[PDB]
Structure formats: structure tokens, C-alpha cells
Design a protein around this ligand. Structure first.
Ligand SMILES: Cc1cc(=O)c2ccccc2[nH]1
Ligand SMILES: [K+]
Length: 274
């Protein structure tokens, strides 16, 4: 995967990004990381798609193999960064795919890019409802310069859901280990503000000027009440669908990459037709 890793100057920042520079029929597949992780979350998903698609994975400001303190930014800046990278590469039509709170970037990317460039979207494991007491408590801890690491440990416990899942534990304990208070504190502020300002991922997607096919694919939360908000939103919106992947962790791109990949291919094939 490091075979495909590049660096370029985006506005005032040097950002890393995966590009397999595959020469083939579109759309390109834009994999969008969440907060305080990088392209390494997608290394198994990249292997599923590598052969048949151009695969781009931008890293956010202060994100990558060598994390760094950088000035404050939000999901609006993540979208502009993602699009400046696509402009530099000469990419027109793309299928955005997000993990967790990468979702705020994806939905704003759909709005900013419009349904010509971005006719569909896949959001993976993104909390569709307003924060529950537990998660609200986690964001609080992430913003506390005293208690941010305690914050991340609580989240790691929720995401692993009691599983000895070797590849996901490697991602959280080795691949996220170099991220400090600067990223995590900012993730807490941006996510807490995203919910407060947009209400929920569902309110934000319903509010798009141009609604389009979006699929939520998730393994967590596993409770029937969470599946019901997805089914109820799906019944209300012809353009919304979900699949419960039944993987063990909140990281389906890592632990069920083959399942993640068939939903991406289905949406990529639908774009290729017409
Ligand atoms: C990678 C990743 C997933 C999440 O759900 C999340 C939530 C809060 C802060 C940072 C985060 N980072
Ligand atoms: K539907």
C-alpha cells in the first residue's frame, strides 16, 4: 500500500494521499478516513478494489505516517482539501466512501461537488442518531487536555465490542498510537459541533439540495433500536438504504473488507450504467 503513497502541497499544507493511479473506466473511488487515523484503515479495502478501480485516499491536515500539530480546521476544510487533491489528479466523477465521522466530509462533499461529479455515496459505521450519554461523555474527555487518552481508551473498548479482533486492535493500538491531544481534542470539538449545528447525519443528508443514492453499511451498534432508525429513515427516503454487515467491530473496512467492497462495487456499477 506504501507503493501507492504520495505527498503534494494542498493550499498551505503538505498532505499525504493514496492513489493507485489505475488507468480505467470511472468512477474513481475516494475513501475518506475519519478523525485521528489515515489511509492505513483502508489497506485491506484498497486490496479488494485495487485491480478494477482508481482508488484515492486523502489524509487530513496533521494526519498520516508522521502526525503533526497544525492550525484548527473542520469538515468544510476537509472537503476543500479532498477536492483540491482530485483537481491536481484530473479526477472528474468519484464515488465517496467514508468511515465514521468522515461522514460529515462525505455529505458536504456531495453538496459541494453536486450530483454530476458525485452521483452516489457510501457511509460506513457512522452514528446516525444524536450522541447518547456514553458517546457525549467520550467527546467531553477527548477535548479535556488532562483526560484525552482516557477518552480514546473508552472509545477503543466500544469499537472492539469485546472482540479479540487482531487487525482492528493493531489499527487502534499501533496505527493510531502517534496521534496526540491536538488531533483528538479537535475531533471532539468538530464532531460535537457537527451534531449541534446539523442535528444528526440523517438531518444533514435529508437537507441536501440534490438528494442521491446513499447507503449506510454498519456492524455497530448491534441493538435493534439502532436498526429501526435506519429502516424508518429508509422507508421515508427512496434514496437511502442500509446493510447490516454483521462484522465484530465498528471498523468493517478492516474486519469485513470483502463485504464493504461488494457494496462499493454495486454503487460503482450503477454509476457506470447510464
Ligand atoms: C477513526 C475514528 C472513528 C470515530 O468514530 C471517532 C469518534 C470520535 C473521535 C475520533 C474518531 N475517530
Ligand atoms: K429507501
Amino acid at each position: 500500500t506504501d507503493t501507492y503513497l504520495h505527498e503534494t502541497l494542498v493550499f498551505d499544507n503538505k498532505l499525504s494521499y493514496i492513489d493507485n493511479q489505475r488507468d480505467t473506466d470511472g468512477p474513481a473511488i475516494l475513501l475518506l478516513p475519519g478523525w485521528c487515523h489515515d489511509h492505513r484503515v483502508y489497506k485491506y479495502l484498497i486490496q479488494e478494489l485495487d485491480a478494477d478501480f482508481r482508488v484515492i485516499v486523502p489524509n487530513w491536515r496533521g494526519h498520516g505516517l508522521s502526525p503533526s500539530e497544525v492550525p484548527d480546521f473542520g469538515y468544510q476544510e476537509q472537503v476543500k482539501d479532498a477536492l483540491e487533491i482530485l483537481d491536481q489528479l484530473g479526477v472528474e466523477t468519484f464515488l465517496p466512501v467514508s468511515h465514521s465521522h468522515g461522514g460529515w466530509v462525505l455529505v458536504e462533499l456531495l453538496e459541494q461537488a453536486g450530483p454530476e461529479r458525485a452521483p452516489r455515496g457510501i457511509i460506513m459505521d457512522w452514528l446516525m442518531w444524536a450522541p447518547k450519554p456514553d458517546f457525549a461523555k467520550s467527546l467531553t474527555l477527548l477535548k479535556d487536555p488532562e483526560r484525552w487518552r482516557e477518552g480514546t481508551h473508552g472509545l477503543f473498548d466500544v469499537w472492539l465490542d469485546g472482540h479479540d479482533e487482531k487487525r482492528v486492535r493493531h489499527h487502534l493500538l499501533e496505527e493510531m498510537a502517534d496521534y496526540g491531544y491536538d488531533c483528538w481534542g479537535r475531533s471532539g470539538r468538530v464532531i460535537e459541533d457537527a451534531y449541534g449545528r446539523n442535528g444528526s447525519p440523517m438531518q444533514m443528508m435529508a437537507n441536501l439540495t440534490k438528494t442521491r443514492p446513499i447507503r449506510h453499511i454498519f456492524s455497530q451498534p448491534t441493538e435493534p433500536e439502532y436498526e429501526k432508525i435506519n429502516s424508518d429513515f429508509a422507508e421515508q427516503h427512496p434514496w437511502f438504504s442500509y446493510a447490516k454487515l454483521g462484522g465484530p467491530t465498528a471498523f468493517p473496512a478492516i474486519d469485513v473488507p470483502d463485504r464493504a467492497a461488494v457494496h462499493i462495487r454495486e454503487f460503482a456499477t450503477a454509476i457506470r450504467q447510464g
